[PDB]
Design a protein around this ligand. Structure first.
Ligand code: ZN
Ligand code: ZN
Length: 65
């Protein structure tokens, strides 16, 4: 798990959904989505959770630090 492959990103769903096995609108560019008009996936806006890519931040490095 290094030369062949290191990172295994598949689900793009934000922290709360990916954990709860929910797929949301939140793309890989959820931040860039905020700039476009987006802000939080329907899940977060529905349950009032926390749209974050912390999962992304805990991968190869603190992507969002
Ligand atoms: Zn979500
Ligand atoms: Zn969310």
């Amino acid at each position: 798990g290094s030369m062949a492959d290191t990172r295994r990103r598949q689900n793009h769903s934000c922290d709360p959904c990916r954990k709860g096995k929910r797929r949301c609108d939140a793309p890989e560019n959820r931040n860039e989505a905020n700039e476009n008009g987006w802000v939080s996936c329907s899940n977060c806006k529905r349950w009032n959770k926390d749209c974050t890519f912390n999962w992304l931040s805990s991968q190869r490095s603190k992507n969002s630090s």
